[PDB]
Amino acid sequence: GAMDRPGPPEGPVVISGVTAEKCTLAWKPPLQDGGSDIINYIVERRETSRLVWTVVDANVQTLSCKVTKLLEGNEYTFRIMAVNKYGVGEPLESEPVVAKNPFVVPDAPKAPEVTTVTKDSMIVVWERPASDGGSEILGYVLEKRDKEGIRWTRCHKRLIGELRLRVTGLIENHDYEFRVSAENAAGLSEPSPPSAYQKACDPIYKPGPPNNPKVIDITRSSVFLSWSKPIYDGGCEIQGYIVEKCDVSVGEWTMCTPPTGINKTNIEVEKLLEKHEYNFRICAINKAGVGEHADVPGPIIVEE
């Protein structure tokens, strides 16, 4: 048919790479070229307050254009026209875009730390950005890796909204290392360095004091003591008890057992000085160590 100028560029204008000084536009060719091929495109800009369109590039041989010399804080709208041998077609106008610098993802956090461990769980804790640089952190992603495993795995879906997570579902006696990432509106940070490997196992602690230490009977040179298992065994097996004596005139706590201890809740302390006055301490032994002493009630006079 008869020939004329091209149709408008097609499609939504797509704006990308927006900073405070530049941005990038892309469009698609017009559906109709008017009967002659499109020679070049014309890209124009107009700050929203202004009336005059200003030329960005009058000879764009591309479906994209890099706009520069933009000005921080100003809002712009952009225009694209197709040109052929018979003239300039109707424009394709973009949506308004403000020249802002983009938001940035947070910095990689510092390495997390494990605190409380069971055979199946670990509490992991980490720090906020030391200073509130405008990260605007929304939450965290905690990852774990088994020492006998290949890849890092998430300990949870979506985000952790605090500085801590009790990670469960851990395999007893496996060793795990942790790393944490921080996410803001811009996206996910690079991960932190890893924690040191920790083994999933129940901790053991020194035992508590022996229970109900008491005197049973007294002779001319001996004292009979008795007690019961400590209420708190330290998650560990009581393997023995240490008994100590003190002369109240002297004040030096001497031993009444080998350091190994005694495997009974009773003892007969013998060869004690007659009519002297004593105090007695009893201690429990774990694989972890010797726990707190329990003092026998009052001082005792060795008599009959």
CA 31 to chain CA mean position, Å: 53
Give which of 226, 223, 243, 246 is closest to 284, Cα–Cα: 243
133, 184 contact by CB (below 8 A): no
What contacts 30, CB < 8 A, 6 or more positions away?
6, 7, 8, 9, 10, 38, 82, 89
| CA dist., res. 20 & res. 47, Å (int) | 14
143, 164 contact by CB (below 8 A): no
| CA dist., res. 66 & res. 58, Å (int) | 13
| CA dist., res. 57 & res. 42, Å (int) | 6
Output the CA torsion sign for 160, 164, 166, 170: positive
What contacts 35, CB < 8 A, 6 or more positions away?
1, 2, 3, 4, 86
288, 219 contact by CB (below 8 A): no
Give which of 223, 228, 212 is closest to 300, Cα–Cα: 223
Q: Which CATH number fits domain 113-200: 2.60.40.10, 3.40.50.410, 3.40.50.300, 3.10.50.40?
A: 2.60.40.10
| CA dist., res. 252 & res. 277, Å (int) | 13
Amino acid code (one letter) for 22 = K
What contacts 298, CB < 8 A, 6 or more positions away?
none
Q: Is 182 left (phi over 0), alpha (psi -120 to 50) or beta?
A: beta
Report the 10 Å Cβ neighbour count for 106: 22
Resolution (A): 2.3
97, 181 contact by CB (below 8 A): no
One DSSP character per residue, the chain reads ---------EEEEEEES--SS-EEEEEE--S--TTS---EEEEEEEETT-SS-EEEEEEE-SSEEEE-S--TT-EEEEEEEEEETTEE---EE---EE--PPP-PPPPPPPPEEEEEETTEEEEE----SS--S----EEEEEEEETT-SS-EESSSS-B-SSEEEE--PPTT-EEEEEEEEEETTEEPPPPPPPPPEE---------PPEEEEEEEE-SS-EEEEEE--S---SS---EEEEEEEETTT--EEESS-TT-BSSSEEEE-SPPTT-EEEEEEEEE-SS-B---EEPSS-EE---
Give which of 238, 231, 198, 221 is closest to 300, Cα–Cα: 221
What contacts 292, CB < 8 A, 6 or more positions away?
206, 208, 209, 283
| CA dist., res. 103 & res. 137, Å (int) | 12
| CA dist., res. 70 & res. 83, Å (int) | 25
Give Cα separations from 234 to 172, 199, 262, 284 (angstroms). 19, 18, 18, 10
| CA dist., res. 213 & res. 225, Å (int) | 7
270, 243 contact by CB (below 8 A): no
Mention the CATH class of domain 211-302. mainly beta
CA 71 to chain CA mean position, Å: 39
| CA dist., res. 111 & res. 180, Å (int) | 7
Q: Strand pairing partners for 245?
A: 254, 280
Give which of 165, 78, 170 is closest to 124, Cα–Cα: 165
The CATH 2.60.40.10 domain(s) of the chain lie at 10-99, 113-200, 211-302
What contacts 60, CB < 8 A, 6 or more positions away?
40, 41, 42, 43
295, 283 contact by CB (below 8 A): no
| CA dist., res. 140 & res. 184, Å (int) | 9
120, 107 contact by CB (below 8 A): no
- Please tell us whether the domain made up of 10-99 is placed in CATH 2.60.40.10: yes
Give Cα separations from 39 to 18, 55, 89, 163, 222 (angstroms). 28, 17, 12, 59, 116
How many residues in total does the chain contain?
304
